[PDB]
Every structure is written in C-alpha cells, then in structure tokens.
Curated annotation (Swiss-Prot), chain A:
Region named Disordered: 7-29
Whole sequence portion shown: 513 to 562 of 1273
Outcome of mutating residue 7 to P: Increased resistance to human covalescent sera neutralization
Name of the molecule in the record: Spike protein S1
Protein task: Attaches the virion to the cell membrane by interacting with host receptor, initiating the infection. The major receptor is host ACE2. When S2/S2' has been cleaved, binding to the receptor triggers direct fusion at the cell membrane. When S2/S2' has not been cleaved, binding to the receptor results in internalization of the virus by endocytosis using host TFRC and GRM2 and leading to fusion of the virion membrane with the host endosomal membrane. Alternatively, may use NRP1/NRP2 and integrin as entry receptors.
Assembly mode: Binds to host ACE2. RBD also interacts with the N-linked glycan on 'Asn-90' of ACE2. Cleavage of S generates a polybasic C-terminal sequence on S1 that binds to host Neuropilin-1 (NRP1) and Neuropilin-2 (NRP2) receptors. Interacts with host integrin alpha-5/beta-1 (ITGA5:ITGB1) and with ACE2 in complex with integrin alpha-5/beta-1 (ITGA5:ITGB1). May interact via cytoplasmic c-terminus with M protein. May interact (via N-terminus) with host bilirubin and biliverdin, thereby preventing antibody binding to the SARS-CoV-2 spike NTD via an allosteric mechanism.
Source organism of this protein record: Severe acute respiratory syndrome coronavirus 2
C-alpha cells in the first residue's frame, strides 16, 4: 500500500465525532491531520479555489 | 487503419525565445508573502524552444 500523506486534501478517515464551530477560544484541534491550539476568527484575505 | 501522407513539405524546425515562460507551482502547498527556494525540474529562462 502506498500512501499520499499530506500532499493533497484527504477523504479517507476512520473515526469521527460530532462537533460544532466555536470562536475566540484558543482550544486544541486537528485540521486534516495537523494539530494546533488557537482561536477561531475571521479575516479579510481572499482564497483561490485550488 | 491509417492513411499515409505524401504532401508534406520539407522545412527545418524554427527556434524562438522563452523569456518568461516555463514556471509552475513546485508543490500543492500554498504560501503567501514569502520567498522560498525549491529544487525541481523546470524550463530554463532565455533558451530555445522548438
Ligand atoms: C538556439 O540554437 C541556435 C543554433 O541551433 C543558436 O544559434 C541560438 O543562439 C540559440 N538560441 C538561444 C536563445 O539559445
């Protein structure tokens, strides 16, 4: 088995739990296999679709 | 099934310049307001292209 790890968006995951969005709280998370701890706010920058 | 061609005119290939062509994203990761160096296969600038 050959794994393309963290080179593209991932859609093959095993576990999942129900969670809801929270703002302005520096809390731990796991975004697409990447872990961090920070608040969630908005920004004015523009994101290209790719 | 193919049809042979006998009306071809003999003409040696021409060469033009490649001033600012032959650049792409080295990886799928997105970076902003930084200057990064990546070693990868690329078309050199100011060279013949057929
Ligand atoms: C392209 O090759 C020809 C000879 O084949 C040469 O005279 C010319 O200078 C080359 N052009 C560039 C941009 O290297």
């Amino acid at each position: 088995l050959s794994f393309e790890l963290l080179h593209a968006p991932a859609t093959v995951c095993g576990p999942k739990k129900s969670t809801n969005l929270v703002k302005n709280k520096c809390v731990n998370f796991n975004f697409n296999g990447l872990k961090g701890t920070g608040v969630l706010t908005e920004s004015n920058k523009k994101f290209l679709p790719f | 099934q193919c049809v042979n061609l006998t009306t071809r005119t003999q003409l040696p290939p021409a060469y033009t310049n490649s001033f600012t062509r032959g650049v792409y994203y080295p990886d799928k990761v997105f970076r902003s307001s930084v200057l990064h160096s990546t070693q990868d296969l690329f078309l050199p600038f100011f060279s013949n292209v057929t």
